[PDB]
Symmetry: C4
Subunit: 206 residues, 4 copies
């Protein structure tokens, strides 16, 4: 649990997140909780050129390491960590199906029992706000109060969990749910969903 181990995993998560086709416009950003702030992917360096010595450390004040620029979308990583104390890893990306549902400005409702992996009966879509600003972070923070993933209108996805492995898995899982909403949405509207009672049983079960 040395800095460098965490820096390798973030790099492995970038490489695996690209494997699954979740990191397409090279929009992916990965962060882990560390010390009193986080370890995050920097700006500029496309994943395959990424070395442990590239990962930037940002403190709880928001001050960063001298000589390294943090990702350009870093402050909502900090908002997610502050709003959800249990999160230890954050995943961001412009995966195409999530973003497609985020352009229609819709929540993804309980069309499948795995919807409960993010804490409830949906995956909400937070309102649009210029990237990198504080107003964007307020939206993310409000949205993650009772869910672990959220779409961000006209933009993409933020997923958070106990570690990188689950966070990656949750982001991947939201994409599949996304895709399923869009494919069935083209045929019928609304889409058949599981009732709130059914979703409370599944939640208990997990």
């Amino acid at each position: 649990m040395e800095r460098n181990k965490l820096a390798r995993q973030i790099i492995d998560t970038c490489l695996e997140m690209t494997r699954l086709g979740l990191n397409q416009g090279t929009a992916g950003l990965v962060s882990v909780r560390y010390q009193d702030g986080m370890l995050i992917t920097p700006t500029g360096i496309p994943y395959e050129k990424l070395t442990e010595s590239h990962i930037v450390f940002i403190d709880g004040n928001g001050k960063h390491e001298e000589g390294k620029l943090p990702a350009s979308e870093w402050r909502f990583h900090m908002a997610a960590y502050q709003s959800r104390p249990d999160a230890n890893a954050v995943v961001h990306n412009h995966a195409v199906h999530c973003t497609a549902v985020s352009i229609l400005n819709r929540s993804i409702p309980a069309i499948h029992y795995m919807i409960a992996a993010a804490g409830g009966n949906s995956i909400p879509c937070a309102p649009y706000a210029t990237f990198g600003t504080r107003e964007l972070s307020e939206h993310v923070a409000l949205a993650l109060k009772n869910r672990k993933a959220t779409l961000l209108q006209h933009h993409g996805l933020i997923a958070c969990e106990v570690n990188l492995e689950k966070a990656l898995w949750l982001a991947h899982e939201v994409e599949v749910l996304a895709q399923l909403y869009l494919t069935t949405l083209a045929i019928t509207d609304p889409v058949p969903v599981l009732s709130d009672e059914e979703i409370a049983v599944v939640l208990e079960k997990f």
Copy 2:
């Protein structure tokens, strides 16, 4: 036909089922018939970390190996084996197109002559029921009485055959049929299908 050979193939089938993109939410489960019960993939271990010593053995009583937890979706593997005596391998997954057709609650009708690979003129969709419960298994069992694959509403697919190779092939084939239903369903409804007489000739031919 030692335990360990069967444990490698299940592992190869997991790895190949991921190759084809049939195992996406890491929802895949593979089982083979063995002795008086089956050999199945356990819960927790994502496929690439899977070793022969991970495969769990569940007997016909439903009792499992001490110290190993069976997949969380194991009892409908047992229902499929009991309902279809000829099955020797079972494949389960949340492949995206199958699941998309399962959210609309529809059967996939004879839109293509390969529909006959699953025993008849369609691929039925069994009604929804909380995962892992006995009511879910009753649906699966009723659904596999005269077909070898079935969708499961709001959930995914169960495919069964004489061995792993064909079972994998059948599941893969149902996904392609699925995808074809959805792509043409967006354009026209209903979709043109082959008549029952045409499908009886193809069945005879196989």
Copy 3:
């Protein structure tokens, strides 16, 4: 131009045709013209298990090599070779977008200038007929009289050219055209196409 070189290329074309995702239900069949008949992929053996000693030779009488079963869909390979004397390689497959357009029973019209790669202003769809029968071959033969690729209703695609390389390329190219018809067909109908005059200029140009 020994038998064995031709048997390797057919095998390479199977392996590459799978690379591009054109051979999905393991429906692919490849044939080359040889001597007074052809060299074709046999029945049973999935591509990766395929060895040079698997390729079957069928003569112009339709008699095959003792001890080897030809593909189950071999006689329309023979019809394509007889109808189009210039063809030296034939490619068949159930690629998903081609087959999707073949289930709607539609021709793919000149929506893109590459449509001219198959000889004219469209890719026709031959009427349905039980696989492997002579009535199916009559359709294929009529359809390839003035085109090099044809969809086959409720089934897939046959593409033919001067060698394996181009045949593979033509089949691949028809899939992309297919996909483009389906994606734009979901939005508008009819789809904008290039005029017959524009298509005669492009034909001259190739």
Copy 4:
């Protein structure tokens, strides 16, 4: 910055452009600015057979290297270089989603903040014109006056930037935007877009 280094990168860009699935009908063409003209991929040789000694040099007069045929779609590479003095690399391709939007003859509007990567609030679609002719080049030149990528009706995409890396990245990014337009276009029309004011803030920000 020797000829040969530039010839390797063009070849690497072809190989990577195929990795991402941007070069499907083997329609891809890559060019870099060099001396008083450019270095471009030749006609005939499919990418994997491509060697440094294949790259053709075309001068500002349009005269080419003796014994090597330039790509068949080379003159709009020259139009892009002349119209956009800052471009040092050009990417062309028939990527399927771009081409799908180009068959409907539509611009891709600001449905996502990354639309600003190409200089403004859209990605325009230049009118159709027989490939390889001068009238086609006039369209491209007019279209790139104030944008860095343009669709070309009934055909595909041209993207241009400071180097190969960014050009490749921009083309890739237009495909994702394309795909997003098409997926949401099937559900609703028109599609929600970001206002011109929002897009002026994002532009300033980049």
